[PDB]
Amino acid sequence: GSHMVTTIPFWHSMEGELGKEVDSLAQRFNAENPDYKIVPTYKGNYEQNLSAGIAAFRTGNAPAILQVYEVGTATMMASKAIKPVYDVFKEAGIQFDESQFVPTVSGYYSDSKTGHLLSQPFNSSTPVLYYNKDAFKKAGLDPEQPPKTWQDLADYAAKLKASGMKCGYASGWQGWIQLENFSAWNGLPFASKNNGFDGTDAVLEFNKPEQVKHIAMLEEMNKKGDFSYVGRKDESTEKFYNGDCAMTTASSGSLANIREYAKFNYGVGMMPYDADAKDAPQNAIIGGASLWVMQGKDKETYTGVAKFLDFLAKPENAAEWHQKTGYLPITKAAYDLTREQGFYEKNPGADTATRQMLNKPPLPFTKGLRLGNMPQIRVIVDEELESVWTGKKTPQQALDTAVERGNQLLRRFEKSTK
Ligand SMILES: O=P(O)(O)OC[C@H](O)CO
Numbered sequence: 001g002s003h004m005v006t007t008i009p010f011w012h013s014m015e016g017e018l019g020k021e022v023d024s025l026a027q028r029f030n031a032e033n034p035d036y037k038i039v040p041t042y043k044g045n046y047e048q049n050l051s052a053g054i055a056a057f058r059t060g061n062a063p064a065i066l067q068v069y070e071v072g073t074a075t076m077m078a079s080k081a082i083k084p085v086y087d088v089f090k091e092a093g094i095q096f097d098e099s100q101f102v103p104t105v106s107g108y109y110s111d112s113k114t115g116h117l118l119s120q121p122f123n124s125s126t127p128v129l130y131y132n133k134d135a136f137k138k139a140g141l142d143p144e145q146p147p148k149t150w151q152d153l154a155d156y157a158a159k160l161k162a163s164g165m166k167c168g169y170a171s172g173w174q175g176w177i178q179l180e181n182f183s184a185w186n187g188l189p190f191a192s193k194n195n196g197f198d199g200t201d202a203v204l205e206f207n208k209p210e211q212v213k214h215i216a217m218l219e220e221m222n223k224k225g226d227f228s229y230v231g232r233k234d235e236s237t238e239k240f241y242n243g244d245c246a247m248t249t250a251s252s253g254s255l256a257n258i259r260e261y262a263k264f265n266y267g268v269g270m271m272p273y274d275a276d277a278k279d280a281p282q283n284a285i286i287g288g289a290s291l292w293v294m295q296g297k298d299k300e301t302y303t304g305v306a307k308f309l310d311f312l313a314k315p316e317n318a319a320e321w322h323q324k325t326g327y328l329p330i331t332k333a334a335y336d337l338t339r340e341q342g343f344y345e346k347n348p349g350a351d352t353a354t355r356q357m358l359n360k361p362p363l364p365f366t367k368g369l370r371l372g373n374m375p376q377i378r379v380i381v382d383e384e385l386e387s388v389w390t391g392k393k394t395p396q397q398a399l400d401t402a403v404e405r406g407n408q409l410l411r412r413f414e415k416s417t418k
């Protein structure tokens with residue numbers, strides 16, 4: 001009737017040092033709240049975790065909490081498999097102040113009609129440029145001056161390669177960085193209806209001259225050996241920390257593993273922008289994930305979930321997550337606490353991710369994205385970009401095809417949710 005501990009499965013995609021920090025947070029919560037036991041389980045990369053969560057729901061054994069990457073948001077929002085987080089709190093009779101979250105992040109994860117959070121913010125990032133300062137030195141570059149523009153990056157990459165580095169430049173999450181964020185950061189839409197927020201009748205718009213020229217630049221670098229393709233996700237993070245790759249654009253959340261494993265002096269810079277683009281940079285759009293609560297659980301489970309989510313949002317815990325991982329602080333209090341503890345004084349580049357998100361007030365179409373079936377559109381994008389790196393298709397053809405294929409998935413979602 002109440003003597004049994006309530007076990008609460010939490011399925012996530014936090015690998016390496018990120019996962020160790022998730023475990024530390026769960027363990028502390030469990031110690032302070034012994035009526036509950038949060039049980040984190042690593043289920044693979046974000047695609048694998050989302051697929052596993054959806055499949056488990058079909059058979060009634062979904063976890064209580066599921067970490068879903070940012071692009072899965074519209075899909076989850078239309079899902080009948082979730083209990084919106086604001087409702088989890090409401091029905092459990094626990095107060096939660098949504099205004100605590102930084103507006104960019106709360107907006108991203110909020111319902112259009114009610115303004116309420118449908119999932120809980122936790123790990124948000126923007127892409128940053130990691131660079132090997134030691135490698136810069138022996139290539140004759142100023143180790144305190146990362147390339148500000150793509151043009152500069154290509155130049156540096158050539159010099160780093162000439163100096164003996166195995167790889168000059170590589171990128172994590174190419175869709176997120178080279179197209180989604182490339183668009184926002186250079187003042188362009190990724191999709192219509194303001195990057196999807198204004199309706200399911202959105203179409204993809206990333207096949208414009210600016211994006212095509214950008215992909216062409218990367219392909220020219222690839223041919224020269226100055227750019228290396230190493231995969232669709234976080235593969236470039238290890239290529240950087242093991243010394244292979246001199247520069248990588250990767251999640252700000254890669255910092256946990258990079259700090260632990262890089263045995264050289266490294267720096268963090270902002271994403272390069274297009275030198276020719278007037279009024280660039282604009283602002284970055286977030287990556288990372290949010291925490292979804294699955295439908296069909298008992299009241300004890302939802303009480304425990306609400307308590308755990310509240311725990312994660314406490315200033316000290318939100319601040320600790322940001323400081324340890326490189327994900328940006330997602331509450332106002334966590335940002336202020338980090339600043340007031342002198343963390344940014346000690347670690348100058350540690351607020352880069354926030355600064356990119358807030359570089360300028362957003363244009364109507366640089367607030368984030370919200371597109372149904374985006375997890376599959378990401379795969380389409382990866383396939384088409386891979387056809388560029390192999391020389392099978394031109395940058396124009398690949399982006400045109402990704403738009404055509406991707407739009408088919410957007411119309412499929414539109415029809416499904418009408
Ligand atoms: O590595 P993350 O957690 O910042 O996520 C990267 C991309 O946003 C995933 O879609």
Ligand SMILES: [Co+2]
Nearest residue numbers: 001002003004
């Ligand atoms: Co009992």
Ligand SMILES: [Mg+2]
Nearest residue numbers: 373412413416
């Ligand atoms: Mg569909």
